């Protein structure tokens, strides 16, 4: 089906305390495969999935070299942005970049992205046509000019439509067993009363991959999501994910309160009634 | 595989 590769980079300044912390992470769908952390032992790009370990030493040197180039740009960016916004040297600030590409079921290019943030809000972004930029404010307008004269969108479009998809396809065949598996959720339903006036009903989806899932509650046909407590999908730690949905329910209608589960590892979607 | 031309903001 549809597949994606993203890289995520975070760089945080440490005023009075030397170089910024730099963390880069690579994913294919919801599966991590590479990391770099500037506080770690190796000082290299490191594998995080078994199917990427089979790359030879030139991959490992190149990626290490390039992630070092990235740390540097972000290092200088923290200094540059602090200048653009006239902030003091006393505070810590955060730079974030995310880039990558989506492919469809036939594995051809669908979409490419390259987003940049300062202090947790949008700074500059590559538009969907991979030709043009959205700048968040007047300070980011300076970067936009700088990158138009550096032909950055042209350089990124070449990567996002070529290299990025070429390399994702390589990862998806190398990682076939892992990356093209689909884990259906092991489902499960629990009752917890409070004081014999109400009852919480909790629907569970455990052990699923990929992370995308929909849980909806429903009072016999019409959906009851004006009561539902829905936690964030959380990692189990073994490559799979967990999520739960709950309604506070009067003592009698638990028969006619149904829980609806949607995940792509299921052929037909699941219905859960309390029994 | 990472992008090869990151450029300063």
């Amino acid at each position, epitope marked *: 089906g549809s597949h994606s590769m993203r890289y995520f980079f975070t760089s945080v300044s440490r005023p009075g305390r030397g170089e910024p912390r730099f963390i880069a992470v690579g994913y294919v769908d919801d599966t991590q495969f590479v990391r770099f952390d500037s506080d770690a032992a190796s000082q290299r790009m490191e594998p995080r999935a078994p199917w990427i370990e089979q790359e030879g030493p*030139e*991959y490992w040197d*190149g990626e290490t*070299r*390039k992630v*070092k*180039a990235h740390s*540097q*740009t972000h290092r*200088v960016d923290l200094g540059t942005l602090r200048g653009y916004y006239n902030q003091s040297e006393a505070g810590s600030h955060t730079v974030q970049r995310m880039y990558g590409c989506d492919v469809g079921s036939d594995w051809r290019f669908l979409r490419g992205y390259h987003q940049y943030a300062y202090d947790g809000k949008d700074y500059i972004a590559l538009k969907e046509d991979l030709r043009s930029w959205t700048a968040a404010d007047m300070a980011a307008q300076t970067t936009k000019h*700088k*990158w138009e*004269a*550096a*032909h*950055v969108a*042209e*350089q990124l479009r*070449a*990567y996002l*439509e*070529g*290299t990025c998809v*070429e390399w994702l396809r390589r990862y998806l065949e190398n990682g076939k067993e892992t990356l093209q598996r689909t884990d259906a959720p092991k489902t499960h339903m629990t009752h917890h009363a409070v004081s014999d006036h109400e009852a919480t009903l909790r629907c569970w989806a455990l052990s699923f991959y990929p992370a995308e899932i929909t849980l909806t509650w429903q009072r016999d046909g019409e959906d009851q999501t004006q009561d539902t407590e829905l936690v964030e999908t959380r990692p189990a730690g073994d490559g799979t994910f967990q999520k739960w949905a709950a309604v506070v329910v009067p003592s009698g209608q638990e028969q006619r309160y149904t829980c609806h589960v949607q995940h792509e590892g299921l052929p037909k979607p699941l219905t859960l009634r309390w029994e | *595989l*990472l*992008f*090869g*031309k*990151p*450029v*300063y903001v």
Partner: T-cell receptor, first 114, second 110 residues
């Protein structure tokens, strides 16, 4: 673009010489090549930013520095006949902006005789 | 041999096609360049290619095939002032060495 100095040089065995190279474009990455008929371009020393240099495949007898981003001199302390070559300075943005391309200096023919 | 070029020299008469080929070894190469050097002067940049397929500019067409690791340069409708040696250049990143081939010399016959 890239300018380099001088265009031609004669030296005897043992003399010292510096080749200048200057660059207009805020390029971080500057490099020094020698070109020879048997073996194309060979990288002597390079620098990915001011203050900072490292060696190529043929660094021996050559000595380099980079206090400013604009300039990247290549020094020979004691010339040998094997240093008879055409030397090219080159520069390239690195992490800086502008056109993502490497450009060359016009070259210095050097000959070393006994 | 990191970057391998076409033997040389290449005689083509004026008006004809000079076809140049080039091979690299690094899978992760992302940038591809053709340089032109007349005898006694410096390599001048003439083509950059970044994506698979053709890039036409004037009488030069570049071609890149990253699966077979192949870079190509065609010179349509040759002239005596195309007589030079043509350098293929390939790199992976911002900080990687630009790898030059030994060059193929093209001689354009009047």
């Amino acid at each position: 673009g890239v300018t380099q100095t001088p265009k031609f040089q004669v030296l005897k065995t043992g003399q010292s010489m510096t080749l200048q190279c200057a660059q207009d474009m805020n390029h971080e990455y500057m490099s020094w090549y020698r070109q020879d008929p048997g073996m194309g371009l060979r990288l002597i020393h390079y620098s990915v930013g001011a203050g900072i240099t490292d060696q190529g495949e043929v660094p021996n007898g050559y000595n380099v520095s980079r206090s400013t981003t604009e300039d990247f001199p290549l020094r020979l302390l004691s010339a040998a006949p094997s240093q008879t070559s055409v030397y090219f300075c080159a520069s390239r943005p690195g992490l800086a902006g502008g056109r993502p391309e490497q450009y060359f200096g016009p070259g210095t023919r050097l000959t070393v005789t006994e | 041999k990191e970057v391998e070029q076409n033997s040389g020299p290449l005689s083509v008469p004026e008006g004809a096609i000079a076809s140049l080929n080039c091979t690299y070894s690094d899978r992760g190469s992302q940038s591809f360049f053709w340089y032109r050097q007349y005898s006694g002067k410096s390599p001048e940049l003439i083509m950059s290619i970044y994506s698979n397929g053709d890039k036409e500019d004037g009488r030069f067409t570049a071609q890149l095939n990253k699966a077979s690791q192949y870079v190509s340069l065609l010179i349509r409708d040759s002239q005596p002032s195309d007589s030079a040696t043509y350098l293929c250049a390939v790199t992976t990143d911002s900080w990687g060495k630009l790898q030059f081939g030994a060059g193929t010399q093209v001689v354009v016959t009047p």
